[PDB]
Amino acid sequence: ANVELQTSLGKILIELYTEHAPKTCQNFYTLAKEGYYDGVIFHRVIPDFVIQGGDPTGTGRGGTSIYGDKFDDEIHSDLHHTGAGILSMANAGPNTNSSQFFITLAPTPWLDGKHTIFGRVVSGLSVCKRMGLIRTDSSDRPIEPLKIIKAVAL
Amino acid sequence: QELSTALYSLDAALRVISRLTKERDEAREALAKFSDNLSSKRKRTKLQPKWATDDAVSQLLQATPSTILENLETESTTSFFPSPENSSFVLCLHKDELLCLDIQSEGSALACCWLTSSKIAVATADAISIFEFPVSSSGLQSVGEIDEKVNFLQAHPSGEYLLAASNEKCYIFSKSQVYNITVAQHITSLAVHPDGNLFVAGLENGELRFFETSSGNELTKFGPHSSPVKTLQFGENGYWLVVTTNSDIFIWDLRKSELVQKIPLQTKVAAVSLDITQLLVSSDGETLYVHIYVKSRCMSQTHVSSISNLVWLNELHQLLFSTSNGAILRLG
Amino acid sequence: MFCSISGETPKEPVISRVSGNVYEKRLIEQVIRETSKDPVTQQECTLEDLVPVKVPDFVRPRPPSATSLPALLSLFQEEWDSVALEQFELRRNLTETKQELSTALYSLDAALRVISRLTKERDEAREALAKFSD
Amino acid sequence: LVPVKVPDFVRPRPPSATSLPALLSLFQEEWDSVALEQFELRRNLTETK
Amino acid sequence: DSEEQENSQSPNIQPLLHTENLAPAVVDNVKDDLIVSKGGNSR
Amino acid sequence: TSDLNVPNLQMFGHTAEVLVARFDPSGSYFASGGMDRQILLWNVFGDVKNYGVLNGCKGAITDLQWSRDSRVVYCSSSDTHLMSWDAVSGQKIRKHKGHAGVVNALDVLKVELLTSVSDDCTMKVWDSRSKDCIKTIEEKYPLTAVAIAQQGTQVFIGGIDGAIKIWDLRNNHCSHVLKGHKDIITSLAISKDGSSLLSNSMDNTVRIFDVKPFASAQRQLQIFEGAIHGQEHNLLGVAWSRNSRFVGAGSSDKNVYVWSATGDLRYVLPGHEGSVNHVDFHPHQDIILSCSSDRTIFLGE
Amino acid sequence: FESTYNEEDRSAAAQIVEEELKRSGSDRLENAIVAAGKGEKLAAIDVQRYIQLKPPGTRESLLQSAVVWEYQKSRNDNLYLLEKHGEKAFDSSLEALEVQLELLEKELVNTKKLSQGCNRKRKHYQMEVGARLAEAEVKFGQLLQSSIQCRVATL
Amino acid sequence: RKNLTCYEFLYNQERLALPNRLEAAEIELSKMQQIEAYAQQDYARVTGQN
């Protein structure tokens, strides 16, 4: 399990924790295979908190997984947000994960509850460190479109 | 593609059937709880007034009074062939009430047949002897052959091919022999459909052996009855059938092969034989009742002493041709 | 890569006009010799209906042991047997599929008869319910 | 213009010398190889004669 | 003694005619609804 | 999901709050009126433009009713009058007088019979040519809304008491009340077939009752919450769909409410600038009409 | 279809169907010959005794030695010809293999997308019709109750 | 392609069949309305004394 993310700033390399959480990575793998992520904005960027993106509409809402609407997360104790670069998913309820995700930039020990952790960025961390310094309007949204050109799975 | 389409149509229709039966029975219970709180043919009126037309005792010998069959010629209803227990096939003419032909062979004859040429007839005996003995010649010309009693006799429309059934689950065809040892169920009732493409044969265990005449392979089993069913006979108009058992008279349909009419009688009362004119029907036994077949006790004649072994309908339906085991011949 | 008739790899593939499908010259020629038509479309076809197109050709890499020798005759017998066994499997598949189709069709016809009968019983039952209500 | 109608419905083969048209091509290749050898050696035979 | 082959295989993908659909049937409607609403903006 | 050129159409006009806007029975035309003492006629399909104005009314159009012929219009005015407007020519046909207060509601019959209530605690039935009230019913508290049965002998009048009165014109026996409400009944509407009544009341509950001679007690079918009424004591309308399976209502909380007649909320769509006086459904297609006290009327699906 | 059914209902309907069924009722000549032969496997046999290398004997030993020599020369030529180019042909075969693999998988995913779309349109249509008939039967039952209560109430 | 063609045929058959079910439901609905109309006319003849 390995996915290259040709983002607009640079190159993001991610390895998926299939051994830890298998269900939440299969959808990502087959989703990189289909590659409908082309031309998708990184709609949310909070300095030292997250970079969220992955919705076709670009309004910060929606995005369909292979299951179509939502699925059930799997969490276990040894998963933690102790570092800066953990690739996790996004949700808006008890079990409401959608196609979007984000990358951590700081230890967030308070966020390791209802929230699933499913990635660790092995290379391209510099890119996320600069994403933390992006022009942002009043809402946590970059002014210019922070698209992802294209993504291979490998 | 055709197989998958057919299979999926079966599944869809199966779901249709499932829901259909489900709330049908629901509504049946709902209603049950709701209501809690040829111009020449004789008419029904003339046939219902039938009574005794003749009193023949000289036709059958009184030394051994017993009969097991009665056959009438289609071309001449005056000729009657009651099977006698004196091991002699007696051919009698109603006009003269005399034994026109006597054929002598050691067992009581159980069945007889009559042709349409007024000359060809066959008979069956308990000695495993079936002979097509012409009445005009009064002698047996052919032999049909065992170690057990024969349970049914049949013949092809040509009149020479012969089929017989015995109680040992073996049947004799006059150029093949198909034997079924998986069931080994004895039979008591059988007849030949006038179409001749297929036939049915009731068995002792209640199942019905329905087989094609040309192929000679059983393709249907109807087992809703208990005890040996005495007889079964197909009609003539095509969609009238009749069955009887050792305690009711029931009517069937050839295409559906399902019950269409039931005449309930007491257990001790057992029918013997049935006659069809699909206009009118005749029955014999402990309780004699004749009912109209087309329109489903309408007739009650008790002039036949002893147990009536057979009943036949004569020409013009003015009177019947019934015989008994008391050496008596009463015409209805 | 595979001729649409036998699955063989056409070194000289062709495409038709009424129905463009990859086909091999010799087999369509023998079909024309048998019946001067295309069974794919049930239409008349001529020799010119195919157009010789350009292909890089399929390279044919040789097994570890294929250097003339009786290896070649053993392969002769083996492929004889293999295509013939394929033929047997496909013929018996014909027989099984047709008999199963006949059985399924009979069951489907009986299902149609019983759904009609049951529908009629529905009509009398519904009318009986409605007429009880008085 | 003719788009590609590759999918079809029939069962392909390996593209090698393991199919009978391909195998028969190798048959005739062996035959013409020994034939070419005979050609050259018969030229040499007539020159030597 | 029943015809298991004629029933299990018959209901193999017959249930899937109602099961496989429910996965992608909750995908197109969600995105279409969001696109229709948010294309009209918050107002 | 209809023949409209646009899914949503804003209608601009009038100089004050619009109080009523009713579809033609054919479903091809409709008119609107309000506090500007004017009636505007419209075209449902096409460019959706005005083809006539009905001037001459000396008061606010509290309510109006289309005629089955789709040729004459009856308007109720706040100035104790009831005018008959010829739609195709625009002249005064007749002016029915006799009330003693603001005429709140109006309804028409399948036979040329008009009915109305006013603050003088009276109900009057009018023939289309009699120019006088042929029958008059006197109550103790002012009446607010009427519904006439298409068959033509029962009339349902809702007023201050919070109980619907059913009056038989011929019988004059009134010992049958549809109790259940606790405040002012703003509007009443009869189902298309004539079996169910839609009631809206200031006690914040939109309820539905059955209209049959026989009942199994507790004639109340169901109630719907959410539709709230403001402090202006407006007369909020309710509507019956063409199939009579979707019931509609307007609320003073800037909400248009559509229910499935089974207690399940279906539409919650906002979009109004003020209290929405009237709501109606198209008798052929799935169009919904809105009419708010902000000089504007909304089109629907 | 939209419904909540147990498999026992399916088996009961199937048993009813079985009961009602019971109540109601080219090839060439060489290929045919070898087929009737090998229908019981009967693997055809041909001489592979060219490796036994028969010791000095009659002319058969000479024939085997000569044919083995010729086979060896042809084998030399073919294998050296194979190693003239190496495995470039094998690389091209694998590349064309992955090309066709991808071309197939593209149309496979297109087909499953189409099937899912047909499924969803079907499920939508069944949902709307089934809801309509559900309210229909509910109002039918209420109508039956109303009719019977009215009829008894008239008395 | 098997299940795609099967889905096509079943879609065609369902689009053909459902109108018949809807029409039968409407017909029985109309009859049940007629019978209830007669019932309520009878109760109305009762109601004339009210």
The C-alpha atoms of residue G8 and residue E11 are separated, in whole angstroms, by 13
Please return the burial class of B179, using the count of CB atoms within 10 Å of its CB with bins 0-12, 13-18 and 19+: exposed
CA distance H49 to chain G (A): 13
G153 chain-F contacts, CB cut-off 8 A:
214
DSSP state at residue F4: -
Strand, helix or coil for residue G76 = helix
Q: How far apart are CA F133 and CA F103, in angstroms?
A: 14
Question: CATH no. for residue C24?
Answer: 3.30.40.10
The terminus-to-terminus CA distance of chain H in angstroms comes to 71
Tokens of F269: 């769509």
Residue A49: active-site member: yes
Are the CB atoms for F225 and F204 separated by under 8 Å?
A: yes
Nearest residue to B24 (alpha-carbon basis) of C123, G1, H28, G5 = C123
Tokens of F85: 């407007």
Q: Are B298 and B290 in contact (CB under 8 A)?
A: yes
- Beta-carbon separation of C100 and B3 below 8 A: yes
SS3 of residue A74 by DSSP: coil
Interface of E with G (CB under 8 A): 2-3, 6-7, 11, 17-18, 20-25, 28
* Degrees to nearest 5, angle at CA B253 with B247 and B254: 120
Angle at B91 between CA B89 and CA B97, to 5 degrees: 135
Going by their DSSP bridges, the two strands B218-220 and F206-210 should be labelled as unpaired
Please state, as a whole number, how many other Cβ atoms lie within 10 Å of the Cβ of residue F95. Answer: 14
Element (H, E) at F11: strand F10-12
Both structure tokens of B17:
């059937």
Strand, helix or coil for residue A53: strand
At residue C106, the 3 state secondary structure works out as helix
Query: Rounded to 5 degrees, what are φ and ψ at G151?
Result: -65, -40
Q: How far apart are CA B112 and CA G66, in angstroms?
A: 89
- Contact (Cβ atoms closer than 8 angstroms) between residue A76 and residue A20: yes
Nearest CA in chain B to E15: B11
Nearest to F294 by CA among F34, F49, F97: F34
d(CA A58, CA G94): 41
Largest CA distance in chain H: 72
Q: H3 to chain B nearest CA, in Å?
A: 9
State how far the Cα of F97 lies from the Cα of F132, in Å rounded to an integer. 7
Interface test with D, best of G31, G72, G74, G95 (most D CBs within 10 A): G74
H50 contact residues in F (CB cutoff 8 A): 171, 173, 176
Inspect the structure and tell me whether chains F and B have 3 or more CB pairs less than 8 Å apart. Answer: no
Angle between helices C69-132 and B2-34 (to 10 degrees): 20
> What is the rounded (10 degree) CA torsion for G103, G109, G114, G120?
180
Q: Cα B94–B97–B101 angle (5° rounding)?
A: 90
| Structural element, H or E, at residue F82 | strand F81-86
d(Cα F64, Cα F41) in Å, to the nearest integer?
12
CA–CA gap between residue A53 and residue A7 (Å, rounded): 11
- For residue G51 the two structure tokens come to 């490796």
Contacts of F158 (CB under 8 A, 6+ apart): F143, F144, F145, F146, F164, F165, F181, F185, F188, F199, F201
Q: What DSSP string runs through B140-173?
A: ----B---S-EEEEEE-TTSS-EEEEETTS-EEE
* Contact indicator for F41, F66 with CB cutoff of 8 Å: no
Asked if residue F2 belongs to a domain, the reply is: no
Among G115, A28, B13, residue whose Cα is nearest residue E20 = G115
Q: Which long-range contacts does C80-88 make (Cβ < 8 Å, 24+ apart)?
A: C80/G34, C80/G44, C81/G38, C81/G43, C81/G44, C83/D20, C84/G31, C84/G34, C84/G35, C84/G38, C87/G31, C87/G35, C88/G35, C88/G39
Q: Which of D8, D22, D30 sits opposite C60 (nearest CB)?
A: D22
Active site residue A102: yes
Residue type at F252 in one-letter notation? S
Q: How far apart are CA B95 and CA B99, in angstroms?
A: 11
Q: How far apart are CA B214 and CA B196, in angstroms?
A: 9
Three-class SS state of B180: coil
Question: Which residue, B119, B111, B105, is CA-closest to B155?
Answer: B111
Name the one residue in this structure whose structure tokens are 């169009």. Answer: F287
Distance CA F145, CA B28 (A): 47
Going by beta carbons, is chain C in contact with chain B, meaning 3 or more pairs sit under 8 Å apart? Answer: yes
Nearest CA to F104 out of F73, F77, F137 is that of F77
Count: domains in chain F? 1
Nearest CA in chain B to C115: B17
- Contacts (Cβ under 8 Å, ≥6 apart) of C42: none
Read off the tokens for B27: 């509504």
Give the residue from chain E lying closest to A99, CA to CA: E27
Which distant-in-sequence residues (6+ apart) come within 8 Å of B31 by Cβ? Answer: C125, C128, C129, C132
Q: Is E22 in contact with G122 (CB distance < 8 Å)?
A: no
In a domain, F118, yes or no: yes
**Residues 6 or more apart whose Cβ sits within 8 Å of residue G155:** none
Token pair belonging to G109: 């995913």
Q: Packing angle between helix C69-132 and helix D20-48, nearest 10 degrees?
A: 160
Token pair for residue G34? 């070898």
Q: Does any CB of chain B come closer than 8 Å to the CB of residue C99?
A: no
CB pairs B-G closer than 8 Å:
37
Q: Which of B13, B24, B34 sits opposite C122 (nearest CB)?
A: B24
Nearest one of A15, A26, A44 to A121, comparing CA atoms: A15
**End-to-end alpha carbon distance in chain E:** 66
- For B64-82, give the DSSP string: S--EEEEEE-SS-TTEEEE
Decide: helix, strand or coil at residue F53: strand
Strand partners, B201: B190, B209
Q: Which of A115, A118, A141, A146 is catalytic?
A: A115
- Could you tell me if F198 and F236 are in contact, meaning their C-beta atoms sit under 8 angstroms apart? no
Ramachandran angles phi, psi of B318, nearest 5°: -75, -35
Q: If we measure between CA atoms, which residue out of B113, B120, B121, B59 comes closest to residue B84?
A: B59
Structural domains of chain A ordered from first start:
1-154 (2.40.100.10)
| Inter-chain residue contact H4 with G146, CB threshold 8 Å | no
The set of residues, in sequence order, having a beta carbon less than 8 Å from that of F297 and lying 6+ positions away, is F11, F13, F18, F21, F32, F289, F290, F291
Respond yes or no: is residue A111 known to be catalytic. Answer: yes
Q: Pairing between strand F72-77 and F29-34?
A: unpaired
Which contacts qualify for F263-269: CB closer than 8 Å, 24 or more apart? Answer: F263/F222, F263/F224, F265/F224, F265/F226
Range of the domain at F127: 7-301
Check: CB of residue F146 under 8 Å from CB of residue F125.
no
- Residue F130's CB is within 10 A of a number of other CB atoms, namely 14
Chain F positions touching chain G (beta carbons under 8 Å)? 214, 216, 245, 262
* Residue from F69, F49, F59, F42 nearest F99 by CA: F59
Beta strand ranges found along F128-272 (DSSP E): 133-138, 143-148, 154-159, 164-168, 177-178, 185-190, 196-201, 206-210, 220-224, 238-240, 247-251, 255-259, 265-267
Burial class (CB in 10 A: 0-12, 13-18, 19+), B79: buried
Q: Taking a C-beta distance cutoff of 8 angstroms, is the pair F199, F207 a contact?
A: yes
Sole residue written with tokens 């229910």: F259
Output Rg (C-alpha) for chain A, integer angstroms. Answer: 14
List the helix and strand counts (H, then E) for chain G.
Answer: 4, 0
Tokens of G100: 């066709």
Residues of H in Cβ contact (< 8 Å) with G125 = 14-15, 18
Distance from CA of H44 to the nearest CA of F (A): 7
Q: Which residue does chain E place closest to G121, by CA atoms?
A: E25
Q: Which are the contacts of B48, defined by CB distance < 8 A and separation ≥ 6? A: B290, B298, B299
How far is it, in rounded angstroms, from Cα B117 to Cα A41? 101
Chain H residue with the nearest C-alpha to that of G107: H1
Given the residues A5, A31, A52, A71, select the one marked as catalytic.
Answer: A52
Output phi, psi for G89, to 5 deg: -60, -40
Give burial (CB, 10 Å; 0-12/13-18/19+) of C79: middle
Is the Cβ pair F214, G150 closer than 8 Å? yes
Pairing status of strand A86-91 against strand A11-16: unpaired
What is the rounded (10 degree) CA torsion for A77, A78, A80, A82? 140
> What DSSP assignment string belongs to B225-263?
--S---EEEE-SSSS-EEEE---EEEEE-TTT-SEEEEE
Distances (CA, A) of F32 to A21, F20, F285, F293: 63, 6, 20, 12
What are the tokens at C34? 């048998």
DSSP code for B43? P
Domain that holds residue C17: 1-53
Contact G43 C113 (CB under 8 A): no
Cα gap E26→E23, rounded to integer Å: 6
> CA F229 to CA F222: how far, in whole Å?
19
Q: Is A91 a catalytic residue?
A: yes
CB-based contacts of F243: which residues, under 8 Å, 6+ apart? none
Chains with 3 or more CB pairs closer than 8 angstroms to C? B, D, G, H
CA–CA gap between residue H2 and residue B89 (Å, rounded): 70
Compute CA distances F92 → F39, F79, F106, whole Å.
13, 16, 18
Active site residue A44: yes
Instruction: Please state, as a whole number, how many other Cβ atoms lie within 10 Å of the Cβ of residue F257.
Output: 24
Half-sphere exposure of residue C81: CA atoms within 13 angstroms, side-chain side? 15
Asked if B329 contacts B323 with a C-beta cutoff of 8 angstroms, the reply is: yes
Residue-by-residue DSSP string for G86-117: TTHHHHHHHHHHHHHHHHHHHHHHHHHHHHHH
Touching partners of B (3+ C-beta pairs < 8 Å)? C, E, G, H
* Chain C residue numbers touching B18 (CB-CB < 8 A): none
Q: Do C133 and H31 touch (CB under 8 A)?
A: no
Strand A97-103 vs strand A50-52: parallel, antiparallel, or unpaired?
unpaired
Buried b (16+ CB within 10 A) or exposed e, B136-175: eeeebeeebeeeeebbbbbbeeeeeebbbbbeebbbbeee
CA distances from D3 to B165, C20, C22, G150 (A): 71, 9, 12, 72
Residue to mutate among B17, B209, B256, with most G CBs inside 10 A, is B17
Active site residue A120: no
Angle between helices D20-48 and G59-85 (to 10 degrees): 110
Residue B12 touches chain H, beta carbons under 8 Å: yes
Q: Is A in contact with B (3 or more beta carbon pairs below 8 Å)? A: no
Distance of residue G93 Cα from the nearest chain D Cα, in angstroms: 8
- The residue written with tokens 């013409």 in the block is D32
3-state secondary structure of G120: helix
CA distances from F217 to F166, F178, G139, H44 (A): 16, 11, 18, 17
Task: List the structure tokens of C127.
Answer: 């009318």
* The residue count for chain B: 332
What CATH number has the domain bearing residue F193? 2.130.10.10
Alpha helix positions (H), chain B: 2-34, 44-47
Nearest to F63 by CA among F4, F143, F127, F164: F143
Closest by CA to B190, choosing from B219, B148, B228, is B228
Q: H39–G151: do the CB atoms touch at under 8 Å?
A: yes
What is the rounded CA–CA span in Å between residue B52 and residue B50? 7
G69: Cβ contacts below 8 Å, ≥ 6 apart: none
* Distance separating alpha carbons of residues B253 and B239, to the nearest angstrom: 5
Resolution in A: 3.2
Determine the Cα–Cα distance for residues B252 and B210; give it in Å rounded to an integer: 14
Of F214, F245, F262, the CB nearest to G153: F214
Residue closest to B102 by CA, chosen among B133, B71, B132, B75: B133
Cα(B254)–Cα(B232) distance, rounded to whole angstroms? 12
| d(C-alpha A29, C-alpha A153), whole Å | 7
| Residue partners of A122: CB distance under 8 A and separation at least 6 | A13, A14, A15
Burial C91-117 (b: 16+ CB within 10 A, else e): eeeeeeeeeeeeebeebbebbeebeee
Neighbours of G136 (CB within 10 A): 15
- Chain B nearest-CA distance from C133, in A, is 9
- Kindly tell me the burial class for residue B78, based on how many C-beta atoms sit within 10 Å of its own C-beta (0-12, 13-18, 19 or more): middle
φ/ψ region of A54 (left if φ > 0, alpha if ψ in -120 to 50, else beta) reads: left
Measured between CB atoms, does B51 come within 8 Å of chain H? no
Q: Mark whether B and H touch (3+ CB pairs within 8 Å).
A: yes
Nearest alpha-carbon partner for G130 in B15, F104, B14: B15
CB H36 within 8 A of CB G145: no
B101 alpha carbon, distance to own chain's centre: 25
CA B78 – CA B93 distance, rounded (Å): 5
List chain E residues with CB under 8 Å of B11.
10-11, 14
> Would you call B109 helix, strand, or coil by DSSP?
strand
